[PDB]
Amino acid sequence: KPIVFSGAQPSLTIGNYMGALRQWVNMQDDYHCIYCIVDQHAITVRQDAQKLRKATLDTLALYLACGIDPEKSTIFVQSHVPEHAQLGWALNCYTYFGELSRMTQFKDKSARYAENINAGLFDYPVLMAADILLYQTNLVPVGEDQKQHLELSRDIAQRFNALYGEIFKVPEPFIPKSGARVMSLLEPTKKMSKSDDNRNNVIGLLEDPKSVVKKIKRAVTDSDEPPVVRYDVQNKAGVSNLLDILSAVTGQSIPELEKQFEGKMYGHLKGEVADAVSGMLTELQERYHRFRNDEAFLQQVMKDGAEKASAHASRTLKAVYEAIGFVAKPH
Amino acid sequence: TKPIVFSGAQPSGELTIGNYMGALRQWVNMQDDYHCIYCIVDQHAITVRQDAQKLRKATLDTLALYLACGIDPEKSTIFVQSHVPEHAQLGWALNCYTYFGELSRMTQFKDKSARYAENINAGLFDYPVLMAADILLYQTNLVPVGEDQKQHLELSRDIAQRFNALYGEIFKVPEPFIPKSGARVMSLLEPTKKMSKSDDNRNNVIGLLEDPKSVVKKIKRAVTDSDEPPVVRYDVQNKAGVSNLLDILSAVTGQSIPELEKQFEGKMYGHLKGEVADAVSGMLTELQERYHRFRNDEAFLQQVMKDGAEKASAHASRTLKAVYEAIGFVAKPH
Ligand SMILES: Nc1ncnc2c1ncn2[C@@H]1O[C@H](COP(=O)(O)OP(=O)(O)OP(=O)(O)O)[C@@H](O)[C@H]1O
Ligand SMILES: Nc1ncnc2c1ncn2[C@@H]1O[C@H](COP(=O)(O)OP(=O)(O)OP(=O)(O)O)[C@@H](O)[C@H]1O
Ligand SMILES: C[C@H]1c2c[nH]c3cccc(c23)S[C@H]1C(=O)O
Ligand SMILES: C[C@H]1c2c[nH]c3cccc(c23)S[C@H]1C(=O)O
Ligand SMILES: [Mg+2]
Ligand SMILES: [Mg+2]
């Protein structure tokens, strides 16, 4: 059974859910899935302390609500496993400074970067590599934005294995994609992104029906006269995106939906999409609030998951320290 | 409670008289007056690539030499850095309160990048942050180091102050303690660069375990100047080699430079080298007599390490838990 590692930032969209996460929720029996809430990555951006703690718990209950089963998968908070920072430091010594500056798009020799960017923002690719390599990870699902970081982890693993023997597994990307690419609501040729400054482009899993219905009702459609609800990505991006969102929620095929909307207006299409999406989020949010309000259950999940995570992580760290040449701590 | 002293050295070679006068002698002398914690920083040592067997041996060479010098495990906490996870944990957190420009301007990083251009790694660049983590974990008041670490200590002062200005009275602000002589003992054949444990050219350095015949030979070959007549005077700019010998002799004996200049009026460099070699070797007789007994006593070495990591971890965890609360991390359940 392959080991799969995902990091979960404590700061999710329907594109994330109906794309990666929903499919992974159904593969917890096919892979040894590990979910790490990366609160040590989070502090690379300064934030109120009390919001960070809350958002760590929000992220945990959200992933449980999405269906991550802590009896089947390991889910845990990054800072609860000291080995993450321990390996991160050690791997810094096997990472070229030049590799990390390539990641900043070589903007680190300037004065603007020197005066404002903290060393965490510069060094976090090595900590991400430590996250992956601690668990003998075989598979890391990543979007396009993380391919360079994943490649660095593979390079570090191979460089270390070449010096010391096979201590790490060389991780691979997870190549197959699921769902459709959910497109942003006001620019239907750009993928919906959790990062978008225009929040009207995005549906978050924790928005209420009312706000979600407003955004879907305002989604950009085409000028075809008469209006035709028909799938055509090239010429009808907005209408096709709406159909793709509806099909991904309901499982109805696009030809079926095209038959449903024969002779109907774009407003009736938007209404149906808004209802379907709004229905999916209510189920999710109902489960979310049950988990989130049970502080003791959430505490028991984090304790169990960090104990599971620690057992594997310490084995790797002991082998790294032995290979490096450290004197073992007496026990 | 006493004020707290923390200092560390890398397991990267045999300690030199430079390490002794810059740092180690003060470590020993502070052990009654303060609460002293001393560390063999193996996580810092791997920023420069070493053979695994070499690094393992060097860690115990360093530990046994601390002890031989009079670091007393019944007065001080002695431990190996990697045995205490909190150092790496606080090291990562402090990365986020350290600006990139503060590290890129560091003189050590530039110097070591030149020496090891084939291994310019991120640990080498990040070195000062992990050092700040080492110091601030223990509520440290005083850090005895040589002059070369002054810039790194200033970053430690800034990091503590910057962190405390956000989150409260979490860290003590540490103060350097650099001595007035022997703070920067220079290399014997290249007197414009400091003496360094890790120097490939061993004729630049005097190891603390070198016998009197080795000491005289290295001091006799130390670079001087072309002055005719030779003059024993302190002048770094024009007389770097002779000045380095005067600094060393001042550090061994405690005589001031002007007292040494009067003492050597009309004399020659061969006489100065005679005095330096004898003073140096006299300074090493006691530690050399005990080092092998320390080094071959595996059980004693293990016990010192076990006890030191346990004490150091007790104190370090309390600081790190306070840090993780301030920053906003969910605490790890009991
Ligand atoms: N709109 C979307 N449609 C389909 N898949 C998506 C969408 N947004 C994210 N994903 C997928 O979800 C996973 C999470 O990746 P990631 O967090 O980088 O996505 P994102 O939300 O677009 O991120 P960002 O906003 O930072 O660019 C990836 O597999 C990615 O391809
Ligand atoms: N030439 C020197 N003169 C005085 N103090 C020194 C000298 N070199 C190092 N020190 C001091 O010795 C202590 C330990 O430093 P460290 O372990 O880095 O030794 P080193 O000889 O500089 O080795 P390396 O070349 O591997 O850095 C520090 O407090 C440092 O300031
Ligand atoms: C959360 C981040 C992260 C930290 N450690 C890991 C390990 C694997 C994948 C990722 C990460 S994905 C990345 C992201 O920015 O999405
Ligand atoms: C050994 C290094 C180190 C790591 N942690 C500490 C703490 C105090 C002083 C020093 C150090 S001195 C410094 C050096 O490179 O000289
Ligand atoms: Mg993406
Ligand atoms: Mg040094």
PDB file of N, CA and C in Angstrom, chain A residues 64-141:
ATOM      1  N   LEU A  64     -12.180  16.518   8.487  1.00  0.00           N
ATOM      2  CA  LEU A  64     -13.058  15.462   8.986  1.00  0.00           C
ATOM      3  C   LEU A  64     -14.440  15.563   8.355  1.00  0.00           C
ATOM      4  N   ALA A  65     -14.953  16.785   8.187  1.00  0.00           N
ATOM      5  CA  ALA A  65     -16.277  16.942   7.591  1.00  0.00           C
ATOM      6  C   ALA A  65     -16.291  16.453   6.146  1.00  0.00           C
ATOM      7  N   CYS A  66     -15.211  16.706   5.405  1.00  0.00           N
ATOM      8  CA  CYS A  66     -15.091  16.238   4.027  1.00  0.00           C
ATOM      9  C   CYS A  66     -15.007  14.727   3.928  1.00  0.00           C
ATOM     10  N   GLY A  67     -14.731  14.045   5.036  1.00  0.00           N
ATOM     11  CA  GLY A  67     -14.774  12.597   5.074  1.00  0.00           C
ATOM     12  C   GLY A  67     -13.464  11.932   5.408  1.00  0.00           C
ATOM     13  N   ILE A  68     -12.410  12.696   5.658  1.00  0.00           N
ATOM     14  CA  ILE A  68     -11.139  12.064   6.108  1.00  0.00           C
ATOM     15  C   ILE A  68     -11.434  11.269   7.391  1.00  0.00           C
ATOM     16  N   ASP A  69     -11.147   9.977   7.389  1.00  0.00           N
ATOM     17  CA  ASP A  69     -11.431   9.071   8.488  1.00  0.00           C
ATOM     18  C   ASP A  69     -10.159   8.887   9.285  1.00  0.00           C
ATOM     19  N   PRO A  70     -10.071   9.418  10.509  1.00  0.00           N
ATOM     20  CA  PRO A  70      -8.818   9.314  11.279  1.00  0.00           C
ATOM     21  C   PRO A  70      -8.505   7.904  11.758  1.00  0.00           C
ATOM     22  N   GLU A  71      -9.456   6.964  11.667  1.00  0.00           N
ATOM     23  CA  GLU A  71      -9.161   5.550  11.862  1.00  0.00           C
ATOM     24  C   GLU A  71      -8.458   4.928  10.664  1.00  0.00           C
ATOM     25  N   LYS A  72      -8.689   5.438   9.452  1.00  0.00           N
ATOM     26  CA  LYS A  72      -8.046   4.920   8.247  1.00  0.00           C
ATOM     27  C   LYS A  72      -6.809   5.716   7.850  1.00  0.00           C
ATOM     28  N   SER A  73      -6.887   7.032   7.939  1.00  0.00           N
ATOM     29  CA  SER A  73      -5.794   7.909   7.590  1.00  0.00           C
ATOM     30  C   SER A  73      -5.197   8.531   8.847  1.00  0.00           C
ATOM     31  N   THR A  74      -3.953   8.969   8.711  1.00  0.00           N
ATOM     32  CA  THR A  74      -3.280   9.737   9.740  1.00  0.00           C
ATOM     33  C   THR A  74      -3.513  11.210   9.448  1.00  0.00           C
ATOM     34  N   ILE A  75      -4.131  11.904  10.396  1.00  0.00           N
ATOM     35  CA  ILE A  75      -4.322  13.344  10.317  1.00  0.00           C
ATOM     36  C   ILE A  75      -3.773  13.938  11.610  1.00  0.00           C
ATOM     37  N   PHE A  76      -2.986  15.008  11.491  1.00  0.00           N
ATOM     38  CA  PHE A  76      -2.278  15.540  12.648  1.00  0.00           C
ATOM     39  C   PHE A  76      -1.778  16.945  12.361  1.00  0.00           C
ATOM     40  N   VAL A  77      -1.428  17.625  13.440  1.00  0.00           N
ATOM     41  CA  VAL A  77      -0.916  18.981  13.388  1.00  0.00           C
ATOM     42  C   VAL A  77       0.607  18.943  13.339  1.00  0.00           C
ATOM     43  N   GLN A  78       1.176  19.646  12.353  1.00  0.00           N
ATOM     44  CA  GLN A  78       2.609  19.594  12.075  1.00  0.00           C
ATOM     45  C   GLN A  78       3.451  19.856  13.327  1.00  0.00           C
ATOM     46  N   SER A  79       3.116  20.895  14.104  1.00  0.00           N
ATOM     47  CA  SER A  79       3.991  21.232  15.224  1.00  0.00           C
ATOM     48  C   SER A  79       3.953  20.192  16.347  1.00  0.00           C
ATOM     49  N   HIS A  80       2.978  19.273  16.347  1.00  0.00           N
ATOM     50  CA  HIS A  80       2.918  18.229  17.371  1.00  0.00           C
ATOM     51  C   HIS A  80       3.943  17.114  17.163  1.00  0.00           C
ATOM     52  N   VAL A  81       4.681  17.119  16.061  1.00  0.00           N
ATOM     53  CA  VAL A  81       5.689  16.111  15.763  1.00  0.00           C
ATOM     54  C   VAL A  81       7.043  16.809  15.613  1.00  0.00           C
ATOM     55  N   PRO A  82       7.868  16.835  16.670  1.00  0.00           N
ATOM     56  CA  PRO A  82       9.139  17.598  16.609  1.00  0.00           C
ATOM     57  C   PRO A  82      10.019  17.235  15.420  1.00  0.00           C
ATOM     58  N   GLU A  83       9.907  15.996  14.929  1.00  0.00           N
ATOM     59  CA  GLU A  83      10.763  15.499  13.856  1.00  0.00           C
ATOM     60  C   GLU A  83      10.675  16.343  12.583  1.00  0.00           C
ATOM     61  N   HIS A  84       9.577  17.071  12.382  1.00  0.00           N
ATOM     62  CA  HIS A  84       9.456  17.886  11.181  1.00  0.00           C
ATOM     63  C   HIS A  84      10.517  18.972  11.138  1.00  0.00           C
ATOM     64  N   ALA A  85      10.715  19.675  12.263  1.00  0.00           N
ATOM     65  CA  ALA A  85      11.750  20.703  12.338  1.00  0.00           C
ATOM     66  C   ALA A  85      13.134  20.081  12.414  1.00  0.00           C
ATOM     67  N   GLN A  86      13.255  18.953  13.109  1.00  0.00           N
ATOM     68  CA  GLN A  86      14.545  18.285  13.186  1.00  0.00           C
ATOM     69  C   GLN A  86      15.047  17.892  11.808  1.00  0.00           C
ATOM     70  N   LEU A  87      14.202  17.223  11.011  1.00  0.00           N
ATOM     71  CA  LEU A  87      14.632  16.871   9.661  1.00  0.00           C
ATOM     72  C   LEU A  87      14.794  18.123   8.807  1.00  0.00           C
ATOM     73  N   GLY A  88      13.925  19.118   8.992  1.00  0.00           N
ATOM     74  CA  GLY A  88      14.056  20.343   8.217  1.00  0.00           C
ATOM     75  C   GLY A  88      15.425  20.982   8.379  1.00  0.00           C
ATOM     76  N   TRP A  89      15.893  21.108   9.634  1.00  0.00           N
ATOM     77  CA  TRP A  89      17.239  21.631   9.852  1.00  0.00           C
ATOM     78  C   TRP A  89      18.282  20.769   9.143  1.00  0.00           C
ATOM     79  N   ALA A  90      18.235  19.454   9.363  1.00  0.00           N
ATOM     80  CA  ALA A  90      19.233  18.568   8.784  1.00  0.00           C
ATOM     81  C   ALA A  90      19.239  18.647   7.253  1.00  0.00           C
ATOM     82  N   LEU A  91      18.061  18.677   6.630  1.00  0.00           N
ATOM     83  CA  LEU A  91      17.975  18.768   5.173  1.00  0.00           C
ATOM     84  C   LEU A  91      18.459  20.114   4.628  1.00  0.00           C
ATOM     85  N   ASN A  92      18.393  21.185   5.429  1.00  0.00           N
ATOM     86  CA  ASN A  92      18.989  22.457   5.036  1.00  0.00           C
ATOM     87  C   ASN A  92      20.446  22.287   4.676  1.00  0.00           C
ATOM     88  N   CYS A  93      21.135  21.392   5.364  1.00  0.00           N
ATOM     89  CA  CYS A  93      22.554  21.217   5.123  1.00  0.00           C
ATOM     90  C   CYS A  93      22.840  20.439   3.844  1.00  0.00           C
ATOM     91  N   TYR A  94      21.809  19.856   3.211  1.00  0.00           N
ATOM     92  CA  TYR A  94      21.933  19.151   1.935  1.00  0.00           C
ATOM     93  C   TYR A  94      21.196  19.858   0.804  1.00  0.00           C
ATOM     94  N   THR A  95      20.760  21.096   1.021  1.00  0.00           N
ATOM     95  CA  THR A  95      20.043  21.901   0.035  1.00  0.00           C
ATOM     96  C   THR A  95      20.941  23.060  -0.364  1.00  0.00           C
ATOM     97  N   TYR A  96      21.197  23.218  -1.662  1.00  0.00           N
ATOM     98  CA  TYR A  96      21.987  24.358  -2.102  1.00  0.00           C
ATOM     99  C   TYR A  96      21.237  25.645  -1.819  1.00  0.00           C
ATOM    100  N   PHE A  97      21.971  26.667  -1.381  1.00  0.00           N
ATOM    101  CA  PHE A  97      21.395  28.001  -1.326  1.00  0.00           C
ATOM    102  C   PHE A  97      20.839  28.392  -2.689  1.00  0.00           C
ATOM    103  N   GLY A  98      21.546  28.010  -3.762  1.00  0.00           N
ATOM    104  CA  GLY A  98      21.092  28.343  -5.099  1.00  0.00           C
ATOM    105  C   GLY A  98      19.746  27.738  -5.454  1.00  0.00           C
ATOM    106  N   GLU A  99      19.432  26.560  -4.916  1.00  0.00           N
ATOM    107  CA  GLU A  99      18.128  25.977  -5.206  1.00  0.00           C
ATOM    108  C   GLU A  99      17.009  26.815  -4.601  1.00  0.00           C
ATOM    109  N   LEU A 100      17.204  27.304  -3.378  1.00  0.00           N
ATOM    110  CA  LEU A 100      16.144  28.049  -2.704  1.00  0.00           C
ATOM    111  C   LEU A 100      15.950  29.424  -3.328  1.00  0.00           C
ATOM    112  N   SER A 101      17.022  30.029  -3.839  1.00  0.00           N
ATOM    113  CA  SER A 101      16.867  31.324  -4.488  1.00  0.00           C
ATOM    114  C   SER A 101      16.216  31.199  -5.870  1.00  0.00           C
ATOM    115  N   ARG A 102      16.426  30.084  -6.576  1.00  0.00           N
ATOM    116  CA  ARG A 102      15.653  29.839  -7.793  1.00  0.00           C
ATOM    117  C   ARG A 102      14.149  29.812  -7.511  1.00  0.00           C
ATOM    118  N   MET A 103      13.743  29.364  -6.318  1.00  0.00           N
ATOM    119  CA  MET A 103      12.318  29.263  -5.999  1.00  0.00           C
ATOM    120  C   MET A 103      11.663  30.634  -5.873  1.00  0.00           C
ATOM    121  N   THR A 104      12.389  31.623  -5.315  1.00  0.00           N
ATOM    122  CA  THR A 104      11.919  33.010  -5.232  1.00  0.00           C
ATOM    123  C   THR A 104      11.878  33.731  -6.639  1.00  0.00           C
ATOM    124  N   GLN A 105      12.135  32.985  -7.725  1.00  0.00           N
ATOM    125  CA  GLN A 105      12.338  33.548  -9.064  1.00  0.00           C
ATOM    126  C   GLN A 105      13.513  34.519  -9.060  1.00  0.00           C
ATOM    127  N   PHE A 106      14.575  34.135  -8.337  1.00  0.00           N
ATOM    128  CA  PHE A 106      15.849  34.867  -8.275  1.00  0.00           C
ATOM    129  C   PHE A 106      15.669  36.338  -7.881  1.00  0.00           C
ATOM    130  N   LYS A 107      14.661  36.626  -7.061  1.00  0.00           N
ATOM    131  CA  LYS A 107      14.406  37.983  -6.593  1.00  0.00           C
ATOM    132  C   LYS A 107      15.116  38.289  -5.262  1.00  0.00           C
ATOM    133  N   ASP A 108      15.983  37.387  -4.791  1.00  0.00           N
ATOM    134  CA  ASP A 108      16.590  37.478  -3.467  1.00  0.00           C
ATOM    135  C   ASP A 108      17.901  38.255  -3.427  1.00  0.00           C
ATOM    136  N   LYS A 109      18.464  38.643  -4.571  1.00  0.00           N
ATOM    137  CA  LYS A 109      19.649  39.492  -4.542  1.00  0.00           C
ATOM    138  C   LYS A 109      19.298  40.980  -4.524  1.00  0.00           C
ATOM    139  N   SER A 110      18.011  41.322  -4.503  1.00  0.00           N
ATOM    140  CA  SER A 110      17.555  42.706  -4.472  1.00  0.00           C
ATOM    141  C   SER A 110      17.401  43.206  -3.036  1.00  0.00           C
ATOM    142  N   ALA A 111      17.313  44.534  -2.902  1.00  0.00           N
ATOM    143  CA  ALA A 111      17.146  45.160  -1.595  1.00  0.00           C
ATOM    144  C   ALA A 111      15.721  45.025  -1.064  1.00  0.00           C
ATOM    145  N   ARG A 112      14.719  45.020  -1.955  1.00  0.00           N
ATOM    146  CA  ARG A 112      13.330  44.883  -1.516  1.00  0.00           C
ATOM    147  C   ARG A 112      13.094  43.539  -0.832  1.00  0.00           C
ATOM    148  N   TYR A 113      13.627  42.458  -1.405  1.00  0.00           N
ATOM    149  CA  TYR A 113      13.524  41.145  -0.771  1.00  0.00           C
ATOM    150  C   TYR A 113      14.292  41.096   0.552  1.00  0.00           C
ATOM    151  N   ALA A 114      15.503  41.661   0.577  1.00  0.00           N
ATOM    152  CA  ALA A 114      16.349  41.590   1.765  1.00  0.00           C
ATOM    153  C   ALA A 114      15.721  42.300   2.962  1.00  0.00           C
ATOM    154  N   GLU A 115      15.037  43.430   2.733  1.00  0.00           N
ATOM    155  CA  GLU A 115      14.527  44.216   3.853  1.00  0.00           C
ATOM    156  C   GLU A 115      13.163  43.748   4.358  1.00  0.00           C
ATOM    157  N   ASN A 116      12.420  42.956   3.578  1.00  0.00           N
ATOM    158  CA  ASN A 116      11.032  42.672   3.917  1.00  0.00           C
ATOM    159  C   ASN A 116      10.685  41.196   4.064  1.00  0.00           C
ATOM    160  N   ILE A 117      11.379  40.298   3.375  1.00  0.00           N
ATOM    161  CA  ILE A 117      11.034  38.881   3.374  1.00  0.00           C
ATOM    162  C   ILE A 117      11.738  38.191   4.532  1.00  0.00           C
ATOM    163  N   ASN A 118      10.999  37.374   5.279  1.00  0.00           N
ATOM    164  CA  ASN A 118      11.627  36.658   6.373  1.00  0.00           C
ATOM    165  C   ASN A 118      12.221  35.339   5.876  1.00  0.00           C
ATOM    166  N   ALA A 119      13.162  34.800   6.662  1.00  0.00           N
ATOM    167  CA  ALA A 119      13.891  33.588   6.284  1.00  0.00           C
ATOM    168  C   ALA A 119      12.995  32.357   6.207  1.00  0.00           C
ATOM    169  N   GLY A 120      11.866  32.356   6.924  1.00  0.00           N
ATOM    170  CA  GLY A 120      10.917  31.267   6.783  1.00  0.00           C
ATOM    171  C   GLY A 120      10.360  31.177   5.376  1.00  0.00           C
ATOM    172  N   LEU A 121       9.990  32.328   4.791  1.00  0.00           N
ATOM    173  CA  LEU A 121       9.479  32.346   3.422  1.00  0.00           C
ATOM    174  C   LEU A 121      10.516  31.831   2.442  1.00  0.00           C
ATOM    175  N   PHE A 122      11.797  32.067   2.722  1.00  0.00           N
ATOM    176  CA  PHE A 122      12.868  31.617   1.843  1.00  0.00           C
ATOM    177  C   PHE A 122      13.183  30.135   2.041  1.00  0.00           C
ATOM    178  N   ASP A 123      13.086  29.648   3.272  1.00  0.00           N
ATOM    179  CA  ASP A 123      13.532  28.306   3.603  1.00  0.00           C
ATOM    180  C   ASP A 123      12.415  27.260   3.631  1.00  0.00           C
ATOM    181  N   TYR A 124      11.150  27.652   3.485  1.00  0.00           N
ATOM    182  CA  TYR A 124      10.071  26.680   3.676  1.00  0.00           C
ATOM    183  C   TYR A 124      10.064  25.520   2.671  1.00  0.00           C
ATOM    184  N   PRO A 125      10.648  25.649   1.466  1.00  0.00           N
ATOM    185  CA  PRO A 125      10.762  24.447   0.613  1.00  0.00           C
ATOM    186  C   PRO A 125      11.531  23.304   1.263  1.00  0.00           C
ATOM    187  N   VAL A 126      12.563  23.585   2.069  1.00  0.00           N
ATOM    188  CA  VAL A 126      13.249  22.484   2.748  1.00  0.00           C
ATOM    189  C   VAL A 126      12.351  21.852   3.809  1.00  0.00           C
ATOM    190  N   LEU A 127      11.586  22.661   4.549  1.00  0.00           N
ATOM    191  CA  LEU A 127      10.667  22.084   5.531  1.00  0.00           C
ATOM    192  C   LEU A 127       9.587  21.238   4.856  1.00  0.00           C
ATOM    193  N   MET A 128       9.095  21.668   3.690  1.00  0.00           N
ATOM    194  CA  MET A 128       8.143  20.840   2.945  1.00  0.00           C
ATOM    195  C   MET A 128       8.770  19.506   2.536  1.00  0.00           C
ATOM    196  N   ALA A 129      10.036  19.526   2.120  1.00  0.00           N
ATOM    197  CA  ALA A 129      10.727  18.279   1.809  1.00  0.00           C
ATOM    198  C   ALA A 129      10.823  17.389   3.043  1.00  0.00           C
ATOM    199  N   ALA A 130      11.172  17.970   4.199  1.00  0.00           N
ATOM    200  CA  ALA A 130      11.194  17.188   5.428  1.00  0.00           C
ATOM    201  C   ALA A 130       9.822  16.587   5.722  1.00  0.00           C
ATOM    202  N   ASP A 131       8.742  17.358   5.511  1.00  0.00           N
ATOM    203  CA  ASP A 131       7.399  16.825   5.744  1.00  0.00           C
ATOM    204  C   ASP A 131       7.186  15.540   4.961  1.00  0.00           C
ATOM    205  N   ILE A 132       7.517  15.571   3.665  1.00  0.00           N
ATOM    206  CA  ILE A 132       7.287  14.432   2.778  1.00  0.00           C
ATOM    207  C   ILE A 132       8.224  13.272   3.120  1.00  0.00           C
ATOM    208  N   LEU A 133       9.529  13.545   3.264  1.00  0.00           N
ATOM    209  CA  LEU A 133      10.501  12.458   3.353  1.00  0.00           C
ATOM    210  C   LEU A 133      10.483  11.751   4.694  1.00  0.00           C
ATOM    211  N   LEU A 134       9.975  12.407   5.749  1.00  0.00           N
ATOM    212  CA  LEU A 134       9.893  11.764   7.059  1.00  0.00           C
ATOM    213  C   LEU A 134       9.076  10.475   7.017  1.00  0.00           C
ATOM    214  N   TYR A 135       8.093  10.376   6.114  1.00  0.00           N
ATOM    215  CA  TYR A 135       7.108   9.295   6.170  1.00  0.00           C
ATOM    216  C   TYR A 135       7.290   8.266   5.055  1.00  0.00           C
ATOM    217  N   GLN A 136       8.480   8.196   4.443  1.00  0.00           N
ATOM    218  CA  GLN A 136       8.727   7.255   3.350  1.00  0.00           C
ATOM    219  C   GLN A 136       7.651   7.389   2.278  1.00  0.00           C
ATOM    220  N   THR A 137       7.298   8.628   1.975  1.00  0.00           N
ATOM    221  CA  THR A 137       6.181   8.909   1.095  1.00  0.00           C
ATOM    222  C   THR A 137       6.470   8.450  -0.333  1.00  0.00           C
ATOM    223  N   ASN A 138       5.490   7.797  -0.943  1.00  0.00           N
ATOM    224  CA  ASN A 138       5.612   7.370  -2.326  1.00  0.00           C
ATOM    225  C   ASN A 138       4.919   8.315  -3.296  1.00  0.00           C
ATOM    226  N   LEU A 139       3.897   9.040  -2.837  1.00  0.00           N
ATOM    227  CA  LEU A 139       2.972   9.794  -3.679  1.00  0.00           C
ATOM    228  C   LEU A 139       2.592  11.097  -2.994  1.00  0.00           C
ATOM    229  N   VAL A 140       2.772  12.196  -3.707  1.00  0.00           N
ATOM    230  CA  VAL A 140       2.382  13.508  -3.209  1.00  0.00           C
ATOM    231  C   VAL A 140       1.461  14.142  -4.243  1.00  0.00           C
ATOM    232  N   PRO A 141       0.161  14.274  -3.970  1.00  0.00           N
ATOM    233  CA  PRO A 141      -0.726  14.995  -4.899  1.00  0.00           C
ATOM    234  C   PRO A 141      -0.515  16.493  -4.758  1.00  0.00           C
TER     235      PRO A 141
END
